[PDB]
Amino acid sequence: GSVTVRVPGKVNLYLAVGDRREDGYHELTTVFHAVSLVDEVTVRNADVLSLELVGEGADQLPTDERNLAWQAAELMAEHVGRAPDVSIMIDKSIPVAGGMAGGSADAAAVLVAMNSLWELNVPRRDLRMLAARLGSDVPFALHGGTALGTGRGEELATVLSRNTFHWVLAFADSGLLTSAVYNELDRLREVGDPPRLGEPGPVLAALAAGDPDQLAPLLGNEMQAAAVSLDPALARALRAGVEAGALAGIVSGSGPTCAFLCTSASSAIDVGAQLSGAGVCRTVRVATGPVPGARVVS
Ligand SMILES: Nc1ncnc2c1ncn2[C@@H]1O[C@H](COP(=O)(O)OP(=O)(O)O)[C@@H](O)[C@H]1O
């Protein structure tokens, strides 16, 4: 028998980055938002641990220990004292090297799929502890929906929305090195005052009300000035999406991926068509959010 689990990629609707300290850590507060670009991960009992990926960028990815999904299987098996005697087949649609944390998504899917394949139901709290050891975006991939996160090792606070939101997401081909982005954020903070965000209250309120008009100008990312300084083309890409009809655009996380909020599914399609036509991006996709975290779909 087989289990398959669907797990979404994410965007950051809000990201505050604390001042650097030692050894060079920045505390983060973030509103993670899972969207309907998803991987499907299928796990079977097998003689030995194995991993295969298929889908658009599947060719780029390690299929051994370097793959987070491979570590997830190891950790999950070890937690219940078992050998990771499973084979894992990942059907990938979350854009690879996209900033949407697809590898973290797959890791969380493997935890859930093994839980179910082995008929164990280790408790959610144990799966979240394993997520935390795996890496900083695995917990949100298990959690999904929308959640406010407040540092690592801290829980995620669930945030419910009255309505679905409609997104156009735009991808460069090269990303940006997250270390480059932090260094430049530190620099911009030594030499000036780049955008500083208020606290996430207003963002959460707009989110709870299901109201894209209220949410749009509250979207924000303290990493965005650094990313646009390293990658001046992002600024034009952001203007272009809004010119095409989006309510707002921001860079998601460390960038360079750009998230544009639209009023509706129709409008997102129009915006996407125009941005795709304007060649400011390598790839343009539409998506909705929030969607659920890792869950069995077989
Ligand atoms: N501590 C870490 N250092 C570097 N990469 C990490 C770490 N933890 C998780 N990851 C990343 O999670 C990624 C998921 O990949 P993918 O979503 O395709 O692109 P993105 O990582 O830009 O969101 C893996 O490629 C891996 O690089």
JSON list of N, CA, C and O in Angstrom, two decimals, residues 15-64:
[
{"chain": "A", "resi": 15, "resn": "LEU", "atom": "N", "xyz": [7.42, 40.51, 6.97]},
{"chain": "A", "resi": 15, "resn": "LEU", "atom": "CA", "xyz": [8.64, 39.99, 7.49]},
{"chain": "A", "resi": 15, "resn": "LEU", "atom": "C", "xyz": [9.35, 41.17, 8.12]},
{"chain": "A", "resi": 15, "resn": "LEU", "atom": "O", "xyz": [9.70, 42.12, 7.39]},
{"chain": "A", "resi": 16, "resn": "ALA", "atom": "N", "xyz": [9.57, 41.07, 9.43]},
{"chain": "A", "resi": 16, "resn": "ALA", "atom": "CA", "xyz": [10.39, 42.03, 10.21]},
{"chain": "A", "resi": 16, "resn": "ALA", "atom": "C", "xyz": [11.67, 41.35, 10.56]},
{"chain": "A", "resi": 16, "resn": "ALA", "atom": "O", "xyz": [11.67, 40.20, 11.00]},
{"chain": "A", "resi": 17, "resn": "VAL", "atom": "N", "xyz": [12.77, 42.03, 10.36]},
{"chain": "A", "resi": 17, "resn": "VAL", "atom": "CA", "xyz": [14.06, 41.44, 10.61]},
{"chain": "A", "resi": 17, "resn": "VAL", "atom": "C", "xyz": [14.72, 42.28, 11.72]},
{"chain": "A", "resi": 17, "resn": "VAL", "atom": "O", "xyz": [14.95, 43.49, 11.53]},
{"chain": "A", "resi": 18, "resn": "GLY", "atom": "N", "xyz": [15.03, 41.66, 12.85]},
{"chain": "A", "resi": 18, "resn": "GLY", "atom": "CA", "xyz": [15.63, 42.40, 13.95]},
{"chain": "A", "resi": 18, "resn": "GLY", "atom": "C", "xyz": [17.06, 42.81, 13.57]},
{"chain": "A", "resi": 18, "resn": "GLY", "atom": "O", "xyz": [17.68, 42.25, 12.65]},
{"chain": "A", "resi": 19, "resn": "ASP", "atom": "N", "xyz": [17.58, 43.80, 14.29]},
{"chain": "A", "resi": 19, "resn": "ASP", "atom": "CA", "xyz": [19.00, 44.18, 14.20]},
{"chain": "A", "resi": 19, "resn": "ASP", "atom": "C", "xyz": [19.95, 43.02, 14.45]},
{"chain": "A", "resi": 19, "resn": "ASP", "atom": "O", "xyz": [19.70, 42.17, 15.30]},
{"chain": "A", "resi": 20, "resn": "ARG", "atom": "N", "xyz": [21.01, 42.97, 13.65]},
{"chain": "A", "resi": 20, "resn": "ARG", "atom": "CA", "xyz": [22.06, 41.95, 13.81]},
{"chain": "A", "resi": 20, "resn": "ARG", "atom": "C", "xyz": [22.68, 41.97, 15.23]},
{"chain": "A", "resi": 20, "resn": "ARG", "atom": "O", "xyz": [22.87, 43.05, 15.78]},
{"chain": "A", "resi": 21, "resn": "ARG", "atom": "N", "xyz": [22.96, 40.80, 15.80]},
{"chain": "A", "resi": 21, "resn": "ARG", "atom": "CA", "xyz": [23.82, 40.68, 17.00]},
{"chain": "A", "resi": 21, "resn": "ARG", "atom": "C", "xyz": [24.96, 39.65, 16.77]},
{"chain": "A", "resi": 21, "resn": "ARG", "atom": "O", "xyz": [25.38, 39.46, 15.63]},
{"chain": "A", "resi": 22, "resn": "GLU", "atom": "N", "xyz": [25.45, 38.99, 17.84]},
{"chain": "A", "resi": 22, "resn": "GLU", "atom": "CA", "xyz": [26.42, 37.86, 17.76]},
{"chain": "A", "resi": 22, "resn": "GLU", "atom": "C", "xyz": [25.83, 36.45, 18.10]},
{"chain": "A", "resi": 22, "resn": "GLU", "atom": "O", "xyz": [25.04, 36.31, 19.03]},
{"chain": "A", "resi": 23, "resn": "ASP", "atom": "N", "xyz": [26.23, 35.42, 17.36]},
{"chain": "A", "resi": 23, "resn": "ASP", "atom": "CA", "xyz": [27.15, 35.55, 16.24]},
{"chain": "A", "resi": 23, "resn": "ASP", "atom": "C", "xyz": [26.37, 35.82, 14.94]},
{"chain": "A", "resi": 23, "resn": "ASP", "atom": "O", "xyz": [26.19, 34.92, 14.11]},
{"chain": "A", "resi": 24, "resn": "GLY", "atom": "N", "xyz": [25.92, 37.07, 14.80]},
{"chain": "A", "resi": 24, "resn": "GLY", "atom": "CA", "xyz": [25.32, 37.60, 13.56]},
{"chain": "A", "resi": 24, "resn": "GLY", "atom": "C", "xyz": [23.90, 37.14, 13.26]},
{"chain": "A", "resi": 24, "resn": "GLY", "atom": "O", "xyz": [23.50, 37.03, 12.11]},
{"chain": "A", "resi": 25, "resn": "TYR", "atom": "N", "xyz": [23.13, 36.85, 14.32]},
{"chain": "A", "resi": 25, "resn": "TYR", "atom": "CA", "xyz": [21.77, 36.34, 14.14]},
{"chain": "A", "resi": 25, "resn": "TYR", "atom": "C", "xyz": [20.84, 37.53, 13.97]},
{"chain": "A", "resi": 25, "resn": "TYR", "atom": "O", "xyz": [21.10, 38.61, 14.51]},
{"chain": "A", "resi": 26, "resn": "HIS", "atom": "N", "xyz": [19.78, 37.37, 13.18]},
{"chain": "A", "resi": 26, "resn": "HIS", "atom": "CA", "xyz": [18.72, 38.36, 13.18]},
{"chain": "A", "resi": 26, "resn": "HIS", "atom": "C", "xyz": [17.45, 37.62, 13.57]},
{"chain": "A", "resi": 26, "resn": "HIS", "atom": "O", "xyz": [17.11, 36.61, 12.94]},
{"chain": "A", "resi": 27, "resn": "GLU", "atom": "N", "xyz": [16.75, 38.12, 14.59]},
{"chain": "A", "resi": 27, "resn": "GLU", "atom": "CA", "xyz": [15.48, 37.49, 14.95]},
{"chain": "A", "resi": 27, "resn": "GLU", "atom": "C", "xyz": [14.46, 37.91, 13.90]},
{"chain": "A", "resi": 27, "resn": "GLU", "atom": "O", "xyz": [14.47, 39.04, 13.42]},
{"chain": "A", "resi": 28, "resn": "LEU", "atom": "N", "xyz": [13.60, 36.98, 13.53]},
{"chain": "A", "resi": 28, "resn": "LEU", "atom": "CA", "xyz": [12.59, 37.23, 12.53]},
{"chain": "A", "resi": 28, "resn": "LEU", "atom": "C", "xyz": [11.18, 37.16, 13.11]},
{"chain": "A", "resi": 28, "resn": "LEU", "atom": "O", "xyz": [10.87, 36.24, 13.87]},
{"chain": "A", "resi": 29, "resn": "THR", "atom": "N", "xyz": [10.34, 38.10, 12.73]},
{"chain": "A", "resi": 29, "resn": "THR", "atom": "CA", "xyz": [8.91, 37.87, 12.83]},
{"chain": "A", "resi": 29, "resn": "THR", "atom": "C", "xyz": [8.20, 37.88, 11.49]},
{"chain": "A", "resi": 29, "resn": "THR", "atom": "O", "xyz": [8.34, 38.80, 10.70]},
{"chain": "A", "resi": 30, "resn": "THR", "atom": "N", "xyz": [7.45, 36.82, 11.25]},
{"chain": "A", "resi": 30, "resn": "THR", "atom": "CA", "xyz": [6.93, 36.59, 9.92]},
{"chain": "A", "resi": 30, "resn": "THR", "atom": "C", "xyz": [5.53, 36.07, 9.89]},
{"chain": "A", "resi": 30, "resn": "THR", "atom": "O", "xyz": [5.14, 35.29, 10.74]},
{"chain": "A", "resi": 31, "resn": "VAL", "atom": "N", "xyz": [4.77, 36.51, 8.89]},
{"chain": "A", "resi": 31, "resn": "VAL", "atom": "CA", "xyz": [3.45, 35.93, 8.55]},
{"chain": "A", "resi": 31, "resn": "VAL", "atom": "C", "xyz": [3.65, 35.05, 7.31]},
{"chain": "A", "resi": 31, "resn": "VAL", "atom": "O", "xyz": [3.92, 35.54, 6.18]},
{"chain": "A", "resi": 32, "resn": "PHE", "atom": "N", "xyz": [3.62, 33.73, 7.56]},
{"chain": "A", "resi": 32, "resn": "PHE", "atom": "CA", "xyz": [3.82, 32.74, 6.51]},
{"chain": "A", "resi": 32, "resn": "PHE", "atom": "C", "xyz": [2.49, 32.54, 5.92]},
{"chain": "A", "resi": 32, "resn": "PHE", "atom": "O", "xyz": [1.52, 32.55, 6.68]},
{"chain": "A", "resi": 33, "resn": "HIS", "atom": "N", "xyz": [2.40, 32.27, 4.63]},
{"chain": "A", "resi": 33, "resn": "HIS", "atom": "CA", "xyz": [1.07, 32.08, 3.98]},
{"chain": "A", "resi": 33, "resn": "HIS", "atom": "C", "xyz": [1.28, 30.99, 2.93]},
{"chain": "A", "resi": 33, "resn": "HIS", "atom": "O", "xyz": [2.07, 31.15, 1.98]},
{"chain": "A", "resi": 34, "resn": "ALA", "atom": "N", "xyz": [0.63, 29.85, 3.15]},
{"chain": "A", "resi": 34, "resn": "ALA", "atom": "CA", "xyz": [0.72, 28.68, 2.27]},
{"chain": "A", "resi": 34, "resn": "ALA", "atom": "C", "xyz": [-0.22, 28.94, 1.09]},
{"chain": "A", "resi": 34, "resn": "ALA", "atom": "O", "xyz": [-1.38, 29.34, 1.29]},
{"chain": "A", "resi": 35, "resn": "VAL", "atom": "N", "xyz": [0.29, 28.69, -0.11]},
{"chain": "A", "resi": 35, "resn": "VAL", "atom": "CA", "xyz": [-0.45, 28.88, -1.36]},
{"chain": "A", "resi": 35, "resn": "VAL", "atom": "C", "xyz": [-0.52, 27.59, -2.21]},
{"chain": "A", "resi": 35, "resn": "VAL", "atom": "O", "xyz": [0.25, 26.69, -1.96]},
{"chain": "A", "resi": 36, "resn": "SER", "atom": "N", "xyz": [-1.45, 27.55, -3.20]},
{"chain": "A", "resi": 36, "resn": "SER", "atom": "CA", "xyz": [-1.81, 26.37, -3.95]},
{"chain": "A", "resi": 36, "resn": "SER", "atom": "C", "xyz": [-0.81, 25.98, -5.07]},
{"chain": "A", "resi": 36, "resn": "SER", "atom": "O", "xyz": [-1.20, 25.44, -6.13]},
{"chain": "A", "resi": 37, "resn": "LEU", "atom": "N", "xyz": [0.47, 26.22, -4.85]},
{"chain": "A", "resi": 37, "resn": "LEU", "atom": "CA", "xyz": [1.48, 25.55, -5.59]},
{"chain": "A", "resi": 37, "resn": "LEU", "atom": "C", "xyz": [2.02, 24.45, -4.69]},
{"chain": "A", "resi": 37, "resn": "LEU", "atom": "O", "xyz": [2.54, 24.75, -3.59]},
{"chain": "A", "resi": 38, "resn": "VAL", "atom": "N", "xyz": [1.95, 23.20, -5.16]},
{"chain": "A", "resi": 38, "resn": "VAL", "atom": "CA", "xyz": [2.08, 22.06, -4.23]},
{"chain": "A", "resi": 38, "resn": "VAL", "atom": "C", "xyz": [2.97, 20.97, -4.79]},
{"chain": "A", "resi": 38, "resn": "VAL", "atom": "O", "xyz": [3.12, 20.85, -6.05]},
{"chain": "A", "resi": 39, "resn": "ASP", "atom": "N", "xyz": [3.59, 20.19, -3.89]},
{"chain": "A", "resi": 39, "resn": "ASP", "atom": "CA", "xyz": [4.23, 18.94, -4.22]},
{"chain": "A", "resi": 39, "resn": "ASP", "atom": "C", "xyz": [3.35, 17.78, -3.71]},
{"chain": "A", "resi": 39, "resn": "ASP", "atom": "O", "xyz": [2.60, 17.96, -2.75]},
{"chain": "A", "resi": 40, "resn": "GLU", "atom": "N", "xyz": [3.47, 16.61, -4.36]},
{"chain": "A", "resi": 40, "resn": "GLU", "atom": "CA", "xyz": [2.71, 15.41, -3.92]},
{"chain": "A", "resi": 40, "resn": "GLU", "atom": "C", "xyz": [3.76, 14.41, -3.69]},
{"chain": "A", "resi": 40, "resn": "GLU", "atom": "O", "xyz": [4.58, 14.17, -4.59]},
{"chain": "A", "resi": 41, "resn": "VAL", "atom": "N", "xyz": [3.82, 13.92, -2.45]},
{"chain": "A", "resi": 41, "resn": "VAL", "atom": "CA", "xyz": [4.86, 13.01, -2.07]},
{"chain": "A", "resi": 41, "resn": "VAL", "atom": "C", "xyz": [4.25, 11.69, -1.66]},
{"chain": "A", "resi": 41, "resn": "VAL", "atom": "O", "xyz": [3.26, 11.64, -0.88]},
{"chain": "A", "resi": 42, "resn": "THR", "atom": "N", "xyz": [4.77, 10.64, -2.32]},
{"chain": "A", "resi": 42, "resn": "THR", "atom": "CA", "xyz": [4.23, 9.29, -2.21]},
{"chain": "A", "resi": 42, "resn": "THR", "atom": "C", "xyz": [5.28, 8.36, -1.61]},
{"chain": "A", "resi": 42, "resn": "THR", "atom": "O", "xyz": [6.48, 8.30, -2.00]},
{"chain": "A", "resi": 43, "resn": "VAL", "atom": "N", "xyz": [4.84, 7.67, -0.58]},
{"chain": "A", "resi": 43, "resn": "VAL", "atom": "CA", "xyz": [5.76, 6.86, 0.16]},
{"chain": "A", "resi": 43, "resn": "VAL", "atom": "C", "xyz": [5.19, 5.42, 0.20]},
{"chain": "A", "resi": 43, "resn": "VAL", "atom": "O", "xyz": [3.99, 5.22, 0.35]},
{"chain": "A", "resi": 44, "resn": "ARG", "atom": "N", "xyz": [6.09, 4.44, 0.03]},
{"chain": "A", "resi": 44, "resn": "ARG", "atom": "CA", "xyz": [5.74, 3.02, 0.01]},
{"chain": "A", "resi": 44, "resn": "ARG", "atom": "C", "xyz": [6.70, 2.36, 0.92]},
{"chain": "A", "resi": 44, "resn": "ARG", "atom": "O", "xyz": [7.83, 2.84, 1.07]},
{"chain": "A", "resi": 45, "resn": "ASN", "atom": "N", "xyz": [6.32, 1.23, 1.50]},
{"chain": "A", "resi": 45, "resn": "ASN", "atom": "CA", "xyz": [7.30, 0.39, 2.19]},
{"chain": "A", "resi": 45, "resn": "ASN", "atom": "C", "xyz": [8.25, -0.13, 1.14]},
{"chain": "A", "resi": 45, "resn": "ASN", "atom": "O", "xyz": [7.85, -0.37, 0.01]},
{"chain": "A", "resi": 46, "resn": "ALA", "atom": "N", "xyz": [9.50, -0.31, 1.53]},
{"chain": "A", "resi": 46, "resn": "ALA", "atom": "CA", "xyz": [10.52, -0.78, 0.63]},
{"chain": "A", "resi": 46, "resn": "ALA", "atom": "C", "xyz": [11.59, -1.40, 1.49]},
{"chain": "A", "resi": 46, "resn": "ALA", "atom": "O", "xyz": [11.66, -1.15, 2.72]},
{"chain": "A", "resi": 47, "resn": "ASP", "atom": "N", "xyz": [12.46, -2.17, 0.83]},
{"chain": "A", "resi": 47, "resn": "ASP", "atom": "CA", "xyz": [13.59, -2.85, 1.46]},
{"chain": "A", "resi": 47, "resn": "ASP", "atom": "C", "xyz": [14.57, -1.82, 1.99]},
{"chain": "A", "resi": 47, "resn": "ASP", "atom": "O", "xyz": [15.18, -2.02, 3.06]},
{"chain": "A", "resi": 48, "resn": "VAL", "atom": "N", "xyz": [14.81, -0.75, 1.22]},
{"chain": "A", "resi": 48, "resn": "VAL", "atom": "CA", "xyz": [15.83, 0.26, 1.62]},
{"chain": "A", "resi": 48, "resn": "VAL", "atom": "C", "xyz": [15.29, 1.69, 1.43]},
{"chain": "A", "resi": 48, "resn": "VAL", "atom": "O", "xyz": [14.35, 1.90, 0.70]},
{"chain": "A", "resi": 49, "resn": "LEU", "atom": "N", "xyz": [15.88, 2.66, 2.09]},
{"chain": "A", "resi": 49, "resn": "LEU", "atom": "CA", "xyz": [15.43, 4.03, 1.89]},
{"chain": "A", "resi": 49, "resn": "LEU", "atom": "C", "xyz": [15.76, 4.43, 0.43]},
{"chain": "A", "resi": 49, "resn": "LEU", "atom": "O", "xyz": [16.91, 4.26, 0.00]},
{"chain": "A", "resi": 50, "resn": "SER", "atom": "N", "xyz": [14.76, 4.89, -0.32]},
{"chain": "A", "resi": 50, "resn": "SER", "atom": "CA", "xyz": [15.09, 5.49, -1.60]},
{"chain": "A", "resi": 50, "resn": "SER", "atom": "C", "xyz": [14.25, 6.78, -1.88]},
{"chain": "A", "resi": 50, "resn": "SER", "atom": "O", "xyz": [13.15, 6.97, -1.33]},
{"chain": "A", "resi": 51, "resn": "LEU", "atom": "N", "xyz": [14.79, 7.65, -2.74]},
{"chain": "A", "resi": 51, "resn": "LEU", "atom": "CA", "xyz": [14.13, 8.93, -3.07]},
{"chain": "A", "resi": 51, "resn": "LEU", "atom": "C", "xyz": [14.23, 9.24, -4.57]},
{"chain": "A", "resi": 51, "resn": "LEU", "atom": "O", "xyz": [15.32, 9.22, -5.13]},
{"chain": "A", "resi": 52, "resn": "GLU", "atom": "N", "xyz": [13.08, 9.52, -5.19]},
{"chain": "A", "resi": 52, "resn": "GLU", "atom": "CA", "xyz": [13.03, 9.98, -6.58]},
{"chain": "A", "resi": 52, "resn": "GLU", "atom": "C", "xyz": [12.15, 11.24, -6.69]},
{"chain": "A", "resi": 52, "resn": "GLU", "atom": "O", "xyz": [11.14, 11.37, -6.02]},
{"chain": "A", "resi": 53, "resn": "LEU", "atom": "N", "xyz": [12.57, 12.18, -7.53]},
{"chain": "A", "resi": 53, "resn": "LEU", "atom": "CA", "xyz": [11.76, 13.34, -7.82]},
{"chain": "A", "resi": 53, "resn": "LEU", "atom": "C", "xyz": [11.50, 13.42, -9.30]},
{"chain": "A", "resi": 53, "resn": "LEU", "atom": "O", "xyz": [12.40, 13.06, -10.08]},
{"chain": "A", "resi": 54, "resn": "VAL", "atom": "N", "xyz": [10.31, 13.90, -9.68]},
{"chain": "A", "resi": 54, "resn": "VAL", "atom": "CA", "xyz": [9.93, 14.22, -11.05]},
{"chain": "A", "resi": 54, "resn": "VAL", "atom": "C", "xyz": [9.22, 15.54, -10.98]},
{"chain": "A", "resi": 54, "resn": "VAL", "atom": "O", "xyz": [8.77, 15.92, -9.89]},
{"chain": "A", "resi": 55, "resn": "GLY", "atom": "N", "xyz": [9.09, 16.24, -12.11]},
{"chain": "A", "resi": 55, "resn": "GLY", "atom": "CA", "xyz": [8.47, 17.57, -12.17]},
{"chain": "A", "resi": 55, "resn": "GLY", "atom": "C", "xyz": [9.48, 18.56, -12.68]},
{"chain": "A", "resi": 55, "resn": "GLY", "atom": "O", "xyz": [10.67, 18.26, -12.75]},
{"chain": "A", "resi": 56, "resn": "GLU", "atom": "N", "xyz": [9.03, 19.77, -12.98]},
{"chain": "A", "resi": 56, "resn": "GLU", "atom": "CA", "xyz": [9.84, 20.75, -13.73]},
{"chain": "A", "resi": 56, "resn": "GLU", "atom": "C", "xyz": [11.33, 20.92, -13.36]},
{"chain": "A", "resi": 56, "resn": "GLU", "atom": "O", "xyz": [12.23, 20.82, -14.23]},
{"chain": "A", "resi": 57, "resn": "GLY", "atom": "N", "xyz": [11.64, 21.22, -12.11]},
{"chain": "A", "resi": 57, "resn": "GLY", "atom": "CA", "xyz": [13.08, 21.37, -11.83]},
{"chain": "A", "resi": 57, "resn": "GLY", "atom": "C", "xyz": [13.68, 20.14, -11.14]},
{"chain": "A", "resi": 57, "resn": "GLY", "atom": "O", "xyz": [14.76, 20.23, -10.55]},
{"chain": "A", "resi": 58, "resn": "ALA", "atom": "N", "xyz": [12.99, 19.00, -11.22]},
{"chain": "A", "resi": 58, "resn": "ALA", "atom": "CA", "xyz": [13.35, 17.81, -10.45]},
{"chain": "A", "resi": 58, "resn": "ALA", "atom": "C", "xyz": [14.80, 17.35, -10.68]},
{"chain": "A", "resi": 58, "resn": "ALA", "atom": "O", "xyz": [15.46, 16.85, -9.76]},
{"chain": "A", "resi": 59, "resn": "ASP", "atom": "N", "xyz": [15.25, 17.54, -11.91]},
{"chain": "A", "resi": 59, "resn": "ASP", "atom": "CA", "xyz": [16.61, 17.25, -12.41]},
{"chain": "A", "resi": 59, "resn": "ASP", "atom": "C", "xyz": [17.75, 17.92, -11.63]},
{"chain": "A", "resi": 59, "resn": "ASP", "atom": "O", "xyz": [18.85, 17.38, -11.55]},
{"chain": "A", "resi": 60, "resn": "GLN", "atom": "N", "xyz": [17.47, 19.11, -11.10]},
{"chain": "A", "resi": 60, "resn": "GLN", "atom": "CA", "xyz": [18.47, 19.88, -10.35]},
{"chain": "A", "resi": 60, "resn": "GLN", "atom": "C", "xyz": [18.71, 19.24, -8.95]},
{"chain": "A", "resi": 60, "resn": "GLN", "atom": "O", "xyz": [19.76, 19.45, -8.37]},
{"chain": "A", "resi": 61, "resn": "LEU", "atom": "N", "xyz": [17.76, 18.47, -8.41]},
{"chain": "A", "resi": 61, "resn": "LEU", "atom": "CA", "xyz": [17.82, 18.16, -6.96]},
{"chain": "A", "resi": 61, "resn": "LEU", "atom": "C", "xyz": [18.53, 16.86, -6.55]},
{"chain": "A", "resi": 61, "resn": "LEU", "atom": "O", "xyz": [18.36, 15.81, -7.19]},
{"chain": "A", "resi": 62, "resn": "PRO", "atom": "N", "xyz": [19.32, 16.93, -5.45]},
{"chain": "A", "resi": 62, "resn": "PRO", "atom": "CA", "xyz": [19.91, 15.70, -4.91]},
{"chain": "A", "resi": 62, "resn": "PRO", "atom": "C", "xyz": [18.81, 14.72, -4.54]},
{"chain": "A", "resi": 62, "resn": "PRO", "atom": "O", "xyz": [17.72, 15.13, -4.07]},
{"chain": "A", "resi": 63, "resn": "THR", "atom": "N", "xyz": [19.08, 13.44, -4.77]},
{"chain": "A", "resi": 63, "resn": "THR", "atom": "CA", "xyz": [18.18, 12.37, -4.35]},
{"chain": "A", "resi": 63, "resn": "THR", "atom": "C", "xyz": [18.84, 11.50, -3.27]},
{"chain": "A", "resi": 63, "resn": "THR", "atom": "O", "xyz": [18.58, 10.30, -3.19]},
{"chain": "A", "resi": 64, "resn": "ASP", "atom": "N", "xyz": [19.69, 12.09, -2.44]},
{"chain": "A", "resi": 64, "resn": "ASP", "atom": "CA", "xyz": [20.38, 11.33, -1.38]},
{"chain": "A", "resi": 64, "resn": "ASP", "atom": "C", "xyz": [20.23, 12.11, -0.10]},
{"chain": "A", "resi": 64, "resn": "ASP", "atom": "O", "xyz": [19.27, 12.87, 0.01]}
]
